[PDB]
Amino acid sequence: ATSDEVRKNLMDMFRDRQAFSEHTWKMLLSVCRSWAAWCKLNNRKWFPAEPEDVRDYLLYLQARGLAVKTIQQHLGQLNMLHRRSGLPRPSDSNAVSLVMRRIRKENVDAGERAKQALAFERTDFDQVRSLMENSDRCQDIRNLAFLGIAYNTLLRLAEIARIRVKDISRTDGGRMLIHIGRTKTLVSTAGVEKALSLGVTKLVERWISVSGVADDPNNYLFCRVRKNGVAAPSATSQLSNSALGGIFGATHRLIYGAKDDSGQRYLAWSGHSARVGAARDMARAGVSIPEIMQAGGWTNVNIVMNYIRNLDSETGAMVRLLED
Amino acid sequence: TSDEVRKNLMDMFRDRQAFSEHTWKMLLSVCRSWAAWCKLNNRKWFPAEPEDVRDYLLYLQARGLAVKTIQQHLGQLNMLHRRSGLPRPSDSNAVSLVMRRIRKENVDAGERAKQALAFERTDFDQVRSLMENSDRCQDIRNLAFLGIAYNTLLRLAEIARIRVKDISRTDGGRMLIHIGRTKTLVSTAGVEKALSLGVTKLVERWISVSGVADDPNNYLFCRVRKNGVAAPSATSQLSNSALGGIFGATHRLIYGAKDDSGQRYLAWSGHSARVGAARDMARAGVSIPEIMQAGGWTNVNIVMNYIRNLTGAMVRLLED
Amino acid sequence: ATSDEVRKNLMDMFRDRQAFSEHTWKMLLSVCRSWAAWCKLNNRKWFPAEPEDVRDYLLYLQARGLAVKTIQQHLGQLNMLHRRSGLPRPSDSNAVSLVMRRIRKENVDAGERAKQALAFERTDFDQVRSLMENSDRCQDIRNLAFLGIAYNTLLRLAEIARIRVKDISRTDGGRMLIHIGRTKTLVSTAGVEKALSLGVTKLVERWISVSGVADDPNNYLFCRVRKNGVAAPSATSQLSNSALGGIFGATHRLIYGAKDDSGQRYLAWSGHSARVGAARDMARAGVSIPEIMQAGGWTNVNIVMNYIRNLDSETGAMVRLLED
Amino acid sequence: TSDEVRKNLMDMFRDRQAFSEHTWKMLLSVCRSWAAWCKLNNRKWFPAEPEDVRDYLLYLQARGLAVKTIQQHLGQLNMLHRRSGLPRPSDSNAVSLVMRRIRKENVDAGERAKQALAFERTDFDQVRSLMENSDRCQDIRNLAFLGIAYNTLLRLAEIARIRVKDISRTDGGRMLIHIGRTKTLVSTAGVEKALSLGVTKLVERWISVSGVADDPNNYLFCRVRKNGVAAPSATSQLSNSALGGIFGATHRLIYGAKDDSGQRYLAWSGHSARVGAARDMARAGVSIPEIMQAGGWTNVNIVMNYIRNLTGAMVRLLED
DNA sequence: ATAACTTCGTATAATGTGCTATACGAAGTTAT
DNA sequence: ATAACTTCGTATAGCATACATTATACGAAGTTAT
DNA sequence: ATAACTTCGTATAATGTGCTATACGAAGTTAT
DNA sequence: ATAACTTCGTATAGCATACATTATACGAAGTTAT
């Protein structure tokens, strides 16, 4: 609570900045730039943040038509800056506590809907599969394997990029299989092994036949394919998540065409579409919530439950009673 | 200090919305009452003196009011003080002790907190068997309302907030109703309340004859005037007084006009289908874990309270 | 924290003493007399109670070979006296908090076993039933009905004494039935109706034939029977719980004879024996925990679970797996 | 103040017993370590300076110790301070942040907290199929120990505290074992761990050949010397080092001597039957609610950690 | 008129975070 | 004199009301398109 | 001897109240 | 020139490490009845 104390705290912050993910840091800076500009504009002090100002700001975020979860992030990062610096948190103020409470209320009462990825189900896999199965085109074959390793496995983006060729050993009738390393938590796991079908395996093949992947196995399975249709292997680099999420966007447009309704948020297939579809498919096929809240490494149902909610199978006991 | 206290309270009024409209309704209702009693005995209503509050509670008790009502008066007074940054009346033995004593004396004389008359499947099936045949807008609406009420267990006000854009469909054709906020939860995630095929038909039929669908941002249920014309609106919801009247009206229909007693719960009301469904489910052998998901409860005690009626495992063990 | 403040608090305590059951008050005085004597003896001040003294005292209770639950009651009542008087609780002290923690540990590690009532099951009801069924003796017939209203119903003592003759209306084949009022909680119930068999009803009869109960129905079902074998009705009074618990003690001795092993605690049948037996019987007969944690008005299983624990039916999943 | 702090710590030592013998073992173990590091760099070991503690944790990390061990060192230091009425080292950013960073750096290099090698029913059935035939006291005891371990899921020390007067019987003949205190619960109520008919026989046979029953206040398991003579005792329990050795010994028996690696968990150990039973139950389709009652857990996370191995719902959905 | 509300006041019942990743539209970077 | 209780007191086992809201119950009193 | 521990130190994994009633042995109270 | 990315930044959805203990792992070093 003295400029010297705060100075010490901020030096502590920088010295052990690896106590947080670079993503966290990204959002911290992001919010600070947002809050600071606003302060400048609205003639106020940005550090330390004063409860009345942070209030005005939060209402400004709301008026900006920003989501409740987003405003949370803002107060959140601000609370973190003051906590890691020796100063009082904005949340610890009555004004800020109340306003947050009010805004949450006001927004829900107007339509605010959290969104999630658009399901990419077998009904979608088969379709694309039928549209790009006979195509000579490199990046066309690659994108099908992806759509395969992805629906078939439910692996996250950050993880499908990480795959290396060795990891893809084989099995039962020449069925493929794979060691991932997904978890990044200590008391969790070091990793699993995942398998493929006569479908998803027969595809992932071609990619390898054409990708020239069978070259220096320290190689990754997924690489970029240039405009001439020639792939570029690289044991040193990984298809950015943007591109991978790109194949899902691209593919949806192929079938459904140009970007649509309203101007933003989940109109086409995104990185999570495959998991979200497999799950329902696996739920529709009456597969215990184990595999379901499991084929994805799901440590908490609320998530798999928000995914299979509109499914008739998840209708409720009252519907069951009512219908006998 | 006087300055601070003026601020804290002022700070509360500014973000009025952080609280339920009702919470404010009661805060003001108690204050009115308290303030009234205070003026009668020449007492300063704020800050409140434990001794004066004690006299007030006892006064409430003498009026023959319910323990729950007395407790509400203490709760509001407590909030006023606490939110002001002042000591709560309950923070003193005179007040803590008198409350306990009032409850105690009251219950040890019987006094019991009531609950809505159950509206169960038999009741639903009977009401529907009769109203199904009506072509009147009102009956069509009312039958749909009761259908959702029983099916979903939603509360009057969650039902009254259902907007047309809130309905969806399972692939199989069942209607899905998305619920944003409830007594126990305000999140942007919300819940999806599915409707049986039959309640679904009931709802569809209402939508049709009413025209609410003429604006996705329109409240599903609305007034229907003497001439049968439904009055759709995206700005004003049907009042809970109306929604609850549908229950009592339906009851009157099958069982006649109610007692002259003046008691409460002589006919079905807003909570009748919740009480009744919970029960219906318990009987069906439904799991507590699942019964709770039905009513949106996060805990297990209301759920248990509603059942305690059904037996005879005994003459049975003894007879053989 | 001033003698005037404490004085005000204690006057508050007395003025609204009905904020507690007379049983609570009984234990408060009980503990205070115990603590005070000790203080006198051990040359200390009893009010306000000083953390070090209350510590010594608790260890003294322990050395007295007193149960953990008992010492809890002592600290408990002391904490209540200081809380309702404006002074700091003894529990709020580090010394007292630690010692309590240590004693709890030390005792468990030596055999301390909470006890419960000895089961009085159908195997016991039938037995006594076969020993006192042909006996002309008034108090012999009375004690059998009791053993009946009690096993058959699972009603608490305090409640079987409360029964009045009207409450005993009839039913299915001339089966008896009964409106009790058990609960004394607001958001609970006002009460239930309970039934009897060809057994428990055929007995409760005689008692009425002989008890002369069918006289002024404001009467209670259970009265005292004097040494000459003549019963004494009374709409104004109730068989004390001591006597009722007496019939269970008496009856056990009849079959098993004189008071036994060690010198104390649950050697014979007590007021709770009947419930405790019915339950297991109802559990052995595979009756869902509903009625079980219900025929007694049980709002919490831990209790019915501690009663059916040695029952094979409650053995566990590992036993189930192990045995196939 | 120096006076108070001397008291609080003195107040802790007086009621030593409020804590596990082990908690004390580690407090003293860390202090020894810390104090050592401190003397090496000429630093005052208490009260501790965040900066000095930060240097200490990093030092621990450089020693190549586990995140859990480093955390334990911080926990003990934290306790010393907190219980003294002083500020906790973790109460400072240098310490809070370094811990996170250490964990983070460590895990993002793999590092994972291990768990005991599973000892499942197949393992039990195999070990028993073999040892059943031995008439040696040791084998008889060991087979009984493993039987209870797997059956009950008890922990080494709860098993090592079982006294003869603690066994009962269901009417059907199954042995019941009453457990007073455990890692997660010290109450006079206790639990009753039932044994299958088969494990029951195993236990009976041990009681018989050993004579522990010669004193109800005798510990069920005890040493058995080179000559086969069991040494019963009501004052000294069999050491956990012994009980755990039974697991590793049994393992050696079926699979040979262990790696030279020096790693941990190369053979079964104290927790092997808990890990294994939990799993066995999950496979059997047992309910989480019930799996938890088996292991005495009150929560749901260790239970989940132990399973994550078993699959293929996919080639399956895809193949058809 | 009047059905069918609304409104509104007092009475009374009912309930139980904070770090890290992805989403995308942009803007920038290579190699065709 | 005792059997058959009652009341007592201390020992222990069995429960389940207090927070801080936010909602319903129900009608009287006012409203508006018919 | 030596099997089979014990002990003990450092390493590292695992877990998650407070009011009111009953129990009894006693002591006291009536009516046989 | 662009296709096919990469890196950016802000918007939002998806998770899951920090307390305060109390326990196990495992062997070396010491022990005691054989």
Distance CA A258, CA D231 (A): 84
**What tokens does A324 get?**
């006998």
**Which method, experimentally, gave rise to this model?**
X-ray
Residue B176, helix vs strand vs coil: strand
Contact between chains at A319 and B290 (C-beta distance less than 8 A): no
* Three-state DSSP string of chain C: CCHHHHHHHHHHHHHCHHHCCHHHHHHHHHHHHHHHHHHHHCCCCCCCCCHHHHHHHHHHHHHCCCCHHHHHHHHHHHHHHHHCCCCCCCCCCHHHHHHHHHHHHHHHCCCCCCCCCCCCCHHHHHHHHHHCCCCCCHHHHHHHHHHHHHHHHCCCHHHHCCCECCCCCEECCCEEEEECCCCCCCCCCCCCEEECCHHHHHHHHHHHHHHCCCCCCCCECCCEECCCCCEECCCCCCCCHHHHHHHHHHHHHHHHCCCCHHHCCCCCCCCCHHHHHHHHHHHHCCCCHHHHCCCCCCCCCHHHHHHCCCCHHHCCHHHHHHCC
Rg (CA), chain A: 24
Pairing of strands B175-182, A170-171: unpaired
Q: Which of C151, C88, C110, C169 is nearest to C279 (CA)?
A: C151
A84 and A224 inside one domain: no
Measured CA to C1', the nucleotide nearest B142 is: E4
Report residue D220 as tokens: 């069920």
Q: Count residue pairs from B and C with Cβ separation < 8 A.
A: 85
CA gap D224, A29 in Å, rounded? 67
Whether CB of D76 is under 7 Å from strand H: the answer is: yes
Residue C255 within a domain: yes
Q: Does A101 touch chain B (CB under 8 A)?
A: yes
- Distance to chain B for A222, nearest Cα, Å: 35
CA gap D110, D121 in Å, rounded:
31
DSSP-derived letter for residue D237 is: P
How distant, in Å, are the alpha carbons of A1, C90, C274, D247 from that of D266?
53, 51, 54, 11
| Structure tokens, C302 | 């831990």
Contacts within 8 Å (CB) and 24+ apart, D102-111: D102/D57, D102/D58, D102/D61, D102/D67, D102/D70, D103/A186, D103/D67, D103/D71, D104/A18, D104/A19, D105/A18, D105/D61, D106/A186, D106/D61, D106/D67, D107/A184, D107/A185, D107/A186, D107/D67, D108/A184, D110/A190, D111/A186, D111/D66, D111/D67
Coil/strand/helix, residue D19? coil
In b/e form, how buried is each residue of B215-224, taking b as 16+ CB within 10 angstroms?
Answer: eeebbbbbbb
D189 and D129 assigned to the same domain: yes
Long-range contact set of residues D114-117: C-beta below 8 Å, sequence gap at least 24: D114/D264, D114/D265, D115/D265, D115/D271, D115/D275, D115/D305, D115/D306, D116/D265, D116/D268, D116/D269, D116/D270, D116/D271, D116/D272, D116/D274, D116/D275, D117/D251, D117/D265, D117/D266, D117/D267, D117/D268, D117/D269, D117/D272, D117/D275
What sign does the dihedral A196-A200-A201-A204 (CA atoms) show?
negative
CB A199 within 8 A of CB A153: no
Q: Which CATH number characterizes residue A237's domain? A: 1.10.443.10
Structural domain range at position C96: 3-113
Asked if B288 and B232 sit in the same domain, the reply is yes
Closest by Cα among B220, B192, B226, B218 to B207: B220
Query: Which positions of chain E lie under 7 Å from any protein Cβ?
Result: 2-16, 18-26, 31-32
Closest listed residue to residue A159, CA positions, set A142, A182, A179: A182
Contact C73, C30 (CB under 8 A): no
**Structural domain contains residue C211:** yes
**Cα dist from C170 to C108, C175, C213, D204, whole Å:** 50, 5, 16, 53
Residue C181: exposure state from Cβ atoms within 10 A (0-12, 13-18, ≥19): middle
- The answer to whether the Cα torsion of B159, B160, B166, B172 is positive or negative is positive
Q: Pick from C162, C18, C17: which is nearest to B105 by CA?
A: C18
- Quick check: is A251 in a domain? yes
Nearest to C281 by CA among C57, C126, C102: C126
- Interface check D106 vs A, CB under 8 A: yes
User: CA geometry: angle at B171 spanning B274 and A265, to 5°?
Assistant: 95
A123 sits within 7 Å of strand E by its CB: no
The C-alpha R_g of chain C, in whole angstroms, comes to: 24
B309 in any annotated domain = no
Rg of chain B's alpha carbons, rounded to an integer? 23
Do both C98 and C133 map to the same domain? no
CB count in 10 Å sphere of residue A218 = 12
| Per annotation, catalytic residue among C55, C156, C162, C252 | C156
Sequence-distant contacts of D21-30: CB under 8 A, at least 24 apart? D26/D72, D26/D76, D27/D76, D27/D79, D27/D80, D29/D76, D30/D72, D30/D73, D30/D76, D30/D77
Q: Output the six-digit token pair for A209.
A: 């036949």
Q: Write down which chains contact chain C via at least 3 CB pairs under 8 A.
A: B, D
Residues in a beta bridge with A232: A224
Q: C238-265 as b/e, with b when 16 or more CB fall inside 10 Å? A: bbeeebbbebbbebbeeeeeeeeeeeee
The answer to whether C150 and C142 are in contact (CB under 8 A) is: no
Instruction: Please say whether the beta carbons of D218 and D232 come within 8 A.
Output: yes
* Residue D83: DSSP 8-state: H
Residue where a domain stops, chosen among D112, D134, D167: D112
d(CA C301, CA C292): 9
Q: Of D171, D167, D175, nearest to D199 (Cα)?
A: D175
C70 touches chain D (CB under 8 A): no
Name, in order, each residue with C-beta under 8 angstroms of C161's C-beta and a sequence gap of 6 or more. C220, C222, C238, C239, C240, C241, C244
Whose C1' is closest to the CA of B183: which nucleotide? F22
Residue D80 near residue D72 (C-beta atoms within 8 A):
no
End-to-end CA distance of chain D, in Å? 75
Does some domain include residue C320? Answer: no
CA–CA gap between residue D210 and residue C45 (Å, rounded)? 55
Residue B186 exposure: Cα atoms within 13 Å on the Cβ side: 17
Span between the terminal Cα atoms of chain C, in Å:
67
* Per-position b or e across A172-183, b if 16+ CB within 10 A of its CB: eeebbbbebebb
The edge-to-edge listing of strands for the beta sheet with D175-182 is D167-169, D175-182, D185-194
Angle at the Cα of D10 from the Cα atoms of D8 and D16, rounded to 5 degrees: 105
- C-alpha B315/C-alpha C287 separation (Å) is 14
Which of A109, A111, A310 is opposite residue B192, by nearest beta carbon? A310
Query: Is there a single domain that holds both residue D133 and residue D14?
Result: no
Is there a contact between C282 and B317 (Cβ–Cβ < 8 Å)?
Answer: yes
Question: Could you tell me which residues come within 8 angstroms of residue D267 by beta carbon, excluding any fewer than 6 positions away?
Answer: D117, D247, D248, D251, D252, D255, D258
How many Å apart are CA A194 and CA C134, to the nearest integer?
77
Cβ-Cβ contacts under 8 Å for B223 (sequence gap 6 or more) = B230, B231, B238, B242
The answer to whether residues C165 and C95 belong to one domain is no
**Contact between residue C173 and residue C260 where contact means Cβ atoms under 8 Å apart:** no
What order do you get walking across the sheet with B167-169 strand by strand? B167-169, B175-182, B185-194
Estimate in Å the CA D25 to C1' G9 gap, whole number.
9
Angle (CA) B42-B48-B54 rounded to 5° is 85
Asked if the Cβ–Cβ distance from C295 to B314 is below 8 Å, we say yes
Answer yes or no: do C38 and C181 share one domain: no
Q: How far apart are CA C82 and CA C46, in angstroms?
A: 11
Give the pairing of strands A170-171 and A175-179: antiparallel
Strand E reaches within 7 A of the B305 CB:
yes
Q: How far apart are CA A94 and CA C230, in angstroms?
A: 74
Cβ atoms within 10 Å of A250's Cβ, excluding its own: 14
Q: Which residue of A has its CA nearest to D310?
A: A291
Separation of alpha carbons B67 and B49, rounded Å: 21
Which residues of chain D have a CB within 8 Å of the CB of C306?
A: 189
On whether both A290 and A159 belong to a single domain, the answer is yes
Residue C221 tokens read as 């079902």
C-alpha triplet A76, A81, A87: angle, nearest 5°: 115
Q: Could you tell me the two tokens for B268?
A: 């079905």
Alpha helices in D85-166 (DSSP H): 93-107, 121-131, 137-152, 156-159
Give the pairing type, strands B167-169 and D223-224: unpaired
Residue A319 domain flag: no
Among chain B residues 268 through 287, which have CB within 7 angstroms of nucleic chain E?
271, 274-275
List the structure tokens of C119.
């089961």
Strands D230-231 and A224-225: unpaired
The answer to whether residues C119 and C44 belong to one domain is no
- Which of C178, C180, C182, C161 has its CA nearest to residue C237? C161
Residue C324 located in a structural domain: no
Measure the N-to-C terminal CA separation of chain B; round to a whole number of Å. 75
Residue of A nearest to D105 (CA): A18
Q: Are A83 and A160 part of one and the same domain?
A: no
C125 and C107 part of one domain: no
Neighbour count for residue B192 (Cβ, 10 Å): 18
| HEC per residue, chain A | CCHHHHHHHHHHHHHCHHHCCHHHHHHHHHHHHHHHHHHHHCCCCCCCCCHHHHHHHHHHHHHCCCCHHHHHHHHHHHHHHHHCCCCCCCCCCHHHHHHHHHHHHHHHCCCCCCCCCCCCCHHHHHHHHHHCCCCCCHHHHHHHHHHHHHHHHCCCHHHHCCCECCCCCEECCCEEEEECCCCCCCCCCCCCEEECCHHHHHHHHHHHHHHCCCCCCCCECCCEECCCCCEECCCCCCCCHHHHHHHHHHHHHHHHCCCCHHHCCCCCCCCCHHHHHHHHHHHHCCCCHHHHCCCCCCCCCHHHHHHCCCCHHHCCHHHHHHCC
Chosen domain end from A113, A139, A162: A113
Q: Which amino acid is at A296?
A: G
Contact A160, A146 (CB under 8 A): yes
B126 shares contact with chain A (CB less than 8 Å): no
Q: What is the CA radius of gyration of chain D?
A: 23
For residue B313, is it within any domain?
Answer: no
The count of structural domains within chain D is 2
Q: Is C149 on the interface with B (CB under 8 A)?
A: no
Answer with the one of D72, D87, D112 that is the final residue of a domain: D112
Written as six digits, the tokens of B44 are 């300063």
Phi, psi of D189, deg, nearest 5 = -80, -60
Residue type at D84 in one-letter notation: S
**Residues D68, D125 share a domain:** no
Q: After which residues is chain A broken (C to N over 2.5 A)?
A: none
Q: What are the backbone angles phi and psi of residue C166, rounded to the nearest 5°?
A: -55, -50
CA pair distance A31, A45, nearest whole angstrom:
15
C240 touches chain D (CB under 8 A): no
Q: What's the Å distance between residue C52 CA and nucleotide H26 C1'?
A: 43
Termini Cα distance of chain A: 67
Would you say the C-beta of D293 is within 7 Å of strand G? no
- The count of C-alpha atoms lying within 13 angstroms of the C-alpha of A162, restricted to the half-sphere facing its C-beta, is 12
What whole-number distance in Å separates Cα of residue D45 and Cα of residue D40? Answer: 11
Whether C156 is a known active-site residue: answer: yes
Residue reference for tokens 């904490």? C79
Is there a contact between C241 and C157 (Cβ–Cβ < 8 Å)? yes
Task: Tell me the C-alpha to C-alpha distance, in Å, between residue A92 and each of A32, A97, D92.
Answer: 19, 7, 19
Q: What is the CATH number of the domain that holds C53?
A: 1.10.150.130
Label residues C194-230 b or e (16+ Cβ within 10 Å = b). Answer: bbbbebbbbbbebbbebbebeeeeebbbbbbbeeeee
HEC assignment per residue over A44-57: CCCCCCCHHHHHHH
